[PDB]
Structures are given as structure tokens and as C-alpha cells.
Design a protein around this ligand. Structure first.
Ligand SMILES: *Cc1c(COP(=O)(O)O)cnc(C)c1O
Ligand SMILES: *Cc1c(COP(=O)(O)O)cnc(C)c1O
Lengths: 388, 388
């Protein structure tokens, strides 16, 4: 029963870190997994307008047609994904819902789900809740944390049914290249898996990174659940609005699940988001947020490497995953040390899976000036403790 | 696995009825399961205010503390329920989430959940999805559809772990009296069950009906999940905001579930509801809505009985459950006939359980004028077809 599955999901480390940052005040948090920016004013105005229009009643379980149609245009133009808004696109209460509900559309007892790690915290638990078995597949610092298909091959079994990829990746900042995805696509077809692609950080890419969607590749739409949303893109985490594009058989099953879950997303919020997707100011806003993230990104990368922590320059999202294993401490000891002595909160890498151990996640979705001081604080402690 | 449980849930009849009203245009729908009223303007203004204050980021999985504190006050004053906002109250994306997540905090494999019927459509599927077995407990029109402990005693087994109660009841409009609840409480305690009390229609009570909460009864809070929300009370169905009050051990397991589900409710929306609870204009609006519902309620009750369909006078919610079995037609055939010839949509009682067969649900959450016309159309065909 779900209760048994829930008991199997272990308590969150990020959770434990919050409650420990609570009794402290002088702490600069680098463990924040959301934009520090507020929602663009024009999006707020569209929401107000929707309220004035009285869009306060139930909407379809699949979401507002107008939004689904707006999503179809976005998926096609930006991601090369051709999806029917009437049957293949579903709006959700945040993209987070897509994992539990998407997996529940097909996952059977004991079936395995490959999860490249370090990975987003919701993956493994969603697999366990759906009735499956999470199988962590390590990604390496040497590959700039880009999933290597040769690693995937070590973990496949007759029970493997799905694969969850996340690019740009939380917590590494790794961006899968077109060829990475092409090889991954072949592997998925070879073992007849369903692949869930988490693309919420798509617009926050840097250097020569470019966002490709696996579902756009030849023969992939039939076996891919593309997950995305407005939380990171438009700084709308508190608005709880995400979506998926998948074959209609999967969509039908997710809407049925929704009928006995959250029912439907917020009506006036969907209206705001549909209008936002067609508003030029939305793209201007995203671009300026991307530019600021990039500025902070270069700061933390330089600082971390120069203070003595070998750190891969992330090409996407707003996280950096410095190596702390050489200090001789575990990811937890490191975080515990930084919090009490540097008054800086960083998430231990182990919270993102076994392969995360030896690292720590730092989010640069915080004021540049706070980042500057957080870096100085960490470096001082590293120097005083002779850890570097 | 969840996918297996999902396949066990049948396709919704209400769903089948919408798509069949779609290709038709002269139809008055009496199948509306939500308020026809708009959300009170001042609540809309509070939401707009929250947007201006930038309450657009993630909030706690359990919900904003300010809203939980406002709900604690509401539960104490209005329901006589003493609950700690910090650990015993959780905000959700609609009250609908409470059933799947609430049952998942404890229900084991094959464990039974007594469900009084005619019942709300989300009850049995939530039990199935949680991993248990739904056991229908009929309620009778001669009892004004008030749940009878005589019936519960016949359906309990050693496998029974929970009981779901709904007063005011959707679809019957029945309201459990204080003594009913006291007797139900005894039964729940005797069989060591957890009772989930769905009180979303609490404020729409009529005649001498008074709303009591089972969790307020002696020693009941420890084994009760009180489910409520803002969807019906304030006309906020499209806002997706409900809540539960329960023992902290249940609440803890529910927030953990949420972490891998919707994460947290809409931030600025929770701010709006917290303000609304303390605003006299909100309660003034509830009173006006209840007054209008009552006016419509008396019309439909009188019209239904006089046209030849024996109908129990509902004391709560905004639904009326006429008996149609005397016409010789099944609930589905009666709904088919009314849609085809009267151009009036009513939902077959069978969609709410076996005990619902022989009845039909009519919602009076629609304009008085539309109700008058629908009654006229229905009576015309009942007479034309010699069904009365
Ligand atoms: C933030 C995030 C999501 C989804 O967030 P929602 O707020 O639920 O839309 C999904 N995946 C990753 C890796 C994220 O960081
Ligand atoms: C409308 C309703 C609910 C909950 O609705 P939400 O919109 O999810 O808050 C719960 N129970 C019954 C019987 C209802 O009619």
C-alpha cells in the first residue's frame, strides 16, 4: 500500500538542514532551490485580470485548453516537440507532480527505474511511491556530470522499465549535449523504456550549452514524458504550475490520477501563464534573469576553485556542485562545518544520491553580494581548518 | 503498484455525462458540483495584495503558518476543534487531496474503508489508490439519507481500518445530527478506526440543521482527519485550497507525501484565504450564498415532489436526490431521457454508489431562473412519457 511505500522513502537531508539553519541567524543560505527573483510584474497583472474576469471556478482535470494550446506552441517552437494540446498536454500543480503521476501511468511491481545521480530529490521517492525500484546510475565529475550511456548499460536488467533524465541538471548544472541525448535515445529504444525528461531549467543555460528535448528526437515522443513548468522560467515557484507532454495513453492515466489528487490547477493562474507565454516581456524577463544567474555563476565557480575546491563550471540551472571529498570530510560533515563555523548553508551532495557523496550543492539563486560573502566565509574556514 | 490500482478504478459517469452534454445546445445543467457564485471581490483583492507583496515563492509543505493559525482559530470557534497550527493542521491543493494522502498515512494492504453511499465520487477511488478495499454502506431515503450505525455495524469486519463521513452530504444533502455523530463516534472508537470527516459544505445548512464536527466529540481528535476547505464556503473552487486537521503523526506522513506530489499550496492564495477568514465581509458573503441556495432549494424540492418524483428535503450542501425508480427507468436511462428530451442534465445516482441507483442527483448551484425552466422541462417529459 502507499503507506508502506512511504515508510520506505527516507527523511530528507535538505529538510534536516533547514531546521538546523533555523536556530541560527547570521547564516547566508546557499541551499535555496528556487529563483530569488519575483514573478515578472506583467505576469502578476495577467493573474489580476483573470481574477477580474471571474476565472475562479473548476477547470478541466487536464488543464485550461487555452494554456495547453499556448504550451503546444512553446513546445513546438522552442523544443521541436509536436504535441496535441487536446490530448497530449496536461497542466499540473507544479512539475513535481509529474514524477509520481507519470510513473503511475505504467510502472509495475518491482520494475526498475534508472536514475542518473546526483539527481533531483523527488525522483527516487516517486519511483518508490509508484511501486517501482529506483536504480541510481552515477554520473562523473570527469564527464562534467553528463550522463554516460556506458554507465547506464551497467545497470540495465530485465526489470528496467524507465529512465529519468534531468537537463539542465539539479544539483550539478550539467547539460546533456545533442549527441548525449541521441545515444540516450538509442539506449531507451533498445531496452524499450519510457524516458521522463525534466526540463524546468531549460532557459538557464550558459557558455555553449543548448537545450535539446529527447522527445523531439526520431521515434521518441511515443516513449517520453516531457516535464517542464513555469516555476524556474518565470520565477513562479509559489504559483504551483507545471506541465507534461506525452502520448495520450499516458496523459489519460495522469488525468484520472489527478481526479483523486489535486483535481485541476488554479484557473486564474493558468490564464496568467497562457498570456505570459505569448508576451514578449516574458522572454525579456527570462533573459535578464539568465544574465544575472550567469554573472553569479562565474563568481562562485572562480571562488570555489580558487579557495581549494575543484569545481566543474555548470552550463545550466543555477547550481554548482563543488568537490569537497579531498578535505577529508563527508558531505554531511562538510555542511555541518560550514553552517556552524562559516554560517553558510550548503546542501550535502549525498542528498542527491550516493554519487553525490564527496560533493556539496550550492545554489547561486541569491544576491551576488551574499554569494561574495558566503564564498569568503567558506574559504576562511577551509583555510583555518587547514582543509585545503 | 499504483498503475494497477488506477486500472481498478472505473471511468467516471459524471465524466461520461459531460461529454454527452457537449454536442448539445439548449441544455440546462443540473449536474454542477460547484458554486455558481464568483469569489467575493475582497478575497480577490487580498490575492492581488499578496502578489504586490511578492508572496510568489515556495512555502512550507504543510502550508503557510499564518494560514494554519487562521484555520486553527476557525476550527476552534466554528467547530469546537482544538488543533495546533504548527503540527496538526495542513493546507492542501483542494480538500480533494486529503482522501488519497490522508488514507496513505496509515492504510495497509487489503484493509477496508467503510464508505456511506450515495457517496462523493472521490471516496472509493482514493481507498483503492491508497491500497485498501472500499466497502459501501448504504444510507436510506426513509432515514433522510442520514448514516445509520445499524448499517455500519453490519459492514464492519476485522479488516476495517477507516470510515469516511460527509456531512452535509454530496449528493444527498443529508446532515448528520449531533446524536448521529455521537453514535458514529462510539462505533469508530469501538472498532479502532480512523474517521475522515468531509465538512466542506458546513456553512450551507438549512431548516433546523446545525453543523457538528466529529473531531470535537470526546476523545475523537486522536482518530479523526477533519477535511475542509475554501472551495465551497467562499466560492473558490478554482483557487485549489483546502485543509485538514489531524493528529501530528498523520499530518507528518501527509506532508512527506506532498513533498513528492504538489509540494505546497499557492503562496499568495494562502495569504488571501488567511485574510478572508478574518474578514467579516467573507462571512457576510457566505450568508448571502446560503440564503440564495436555500431559496433555490425550496423551489426544486417543491417542484420535484409535485411533478411526481418523491424527494427528500435536503438540509445541507446544494444537492437534492430525487427518487426516480418508480418511473421504471434506471438512473442512467432517466439521465439519458432528461438530457435527450428535456435538455436537462442530471447525474445518475448510480455514479455515487449502488445505494444511489434508483435516484438522480440535481445540483441547485445554478441560477434560480434556470432551475425553474429545468423543472418545467423535466415535468413536461415525465408527463409526456407517462412516467408519472
Ligand atoms: C524546481 C524543480 C522541479 C519542479 O518544480 P515545480 O515547483 O514543482 O514546478 C522539477 N525538477 C527539478 C530538478 C527542479 O529543480
Ligand atoms: C467539492 C467537494 C470537496 C472538495 O473540493 P476541493 O475543490 O478539492 O476543495 C470535497 N468533498 C465533497 C463532498 C465535495 O463536494
Amino acid at each position: 500500500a502507499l503507506s508502506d511505500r512511504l515508510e520506505l522513502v527516507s527523511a530528507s537531508e535538505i529538510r534536516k538542514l533547514f531546521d538546523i539553519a533555523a536556530g541560527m541567524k547570521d547564516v547566508i543560505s546557499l541551499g535555496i532551490g528556487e529563483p530569488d527573483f519575483d514573478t515578472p510584474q506583467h505576469i502578476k497583472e495577467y493573474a489580476k485580470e483573470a481574477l477580474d474576469k471571474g476565472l475562479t471556478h473548476y477547470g478541466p482535470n487536464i488543464g485550461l485548453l487555452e494554456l495547453r494550446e499556448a504550451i503546444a506552441e512553446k513546445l513546438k517552437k522552442q523544443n521541436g516537440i509536436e504535441a496535441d494540446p487536446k490530448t497530449e498536454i496536461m497542466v499540473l500543480l507544479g512539475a513535481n507532480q509529474a514524477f509520481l503521476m507519470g510513473l503511475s501511468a505504467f510502472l509495475k511491481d518491482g520494475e526498475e527505474v534508472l536514475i542518473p545521480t546526483p539527481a533531483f530529490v523527488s525522483y527516487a521517492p516517486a519511483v518508490i511511491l509508484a511501486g517501482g525500484k529506483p536504480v541510481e546510475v552515477p554520473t562523473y565529475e570527469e564527464d562534467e556530470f553528463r550522463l554516460n550511456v556506458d554507465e547506464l548499460k551497467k545497470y540495465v536488467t530485465d526489470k528496467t522499465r524507465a529512465l529519468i533524465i534531468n537537463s539542465p541538471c539539479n544539483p550539478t548544472g550539467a547539460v546533456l549535449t545533442k549527441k548525449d541525448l541521441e545515444e540516450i535515445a538509442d539506449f531507451v529504444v533498445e531496452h524499450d523504456l519510457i524516458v521522463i525528461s525534466d526540463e524546468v531549467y531549460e532557459h538557464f543555460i550558459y557558455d555553449d550549452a543548448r537545450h535539446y528535448s529527447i522527445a523531439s528526437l526520431d521515434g521518441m515522443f511515443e516513449r517520453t514524458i516531457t516535464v517542464n513548468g513555469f516555476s524556474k522560467t518565470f520565477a513562479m515557484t509559489g504559483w504551483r504550475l507545471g506541465f507534461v507532454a506525452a502520448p495520450s495513453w499516458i496523459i489519460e492515466r495522469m488525468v484520472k490520477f489527478q481526479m483523486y489528487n489535486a483535481t485541476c490547477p488554479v484557473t486564474f493562474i493558468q490564464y496568467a501563464a497562457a498570456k505570459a507565454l505569448k508576451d514578449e516581456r516574458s522572454w525579456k524577463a527570462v533573459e535578464e534573469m539568465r544574465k544575472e544567474y550567469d554573472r553569479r555563476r562565474k563568481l562562485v565557480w572562480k571562488r570555489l576553485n580558487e579557495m581549494g575546491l575543484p569545481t566543474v563550471k555548470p552550463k545550466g540551472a543555477f547550481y554548482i556542485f563543488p568537490r569537497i571529498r579531498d578535505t577529508g570530510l563527508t558531505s554531511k560533515k562538510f555542511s555541518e562545518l560550514m553552517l556552524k563555523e562559516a554560517r553558510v548553508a550548503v546542501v550535502p551532495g549525498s542528498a542527491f544520491g550516493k554519487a553525490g557523496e564527496g560533493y556539496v550543492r550550492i545554489s547561486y539563486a541569491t544576491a551576488y553580494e551574499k554569494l561574495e560573502e558566503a564564498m569568503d566565509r567558506m574559504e576562511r574556514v577551509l583555510k583555518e581548518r587547514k582543509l585545503v
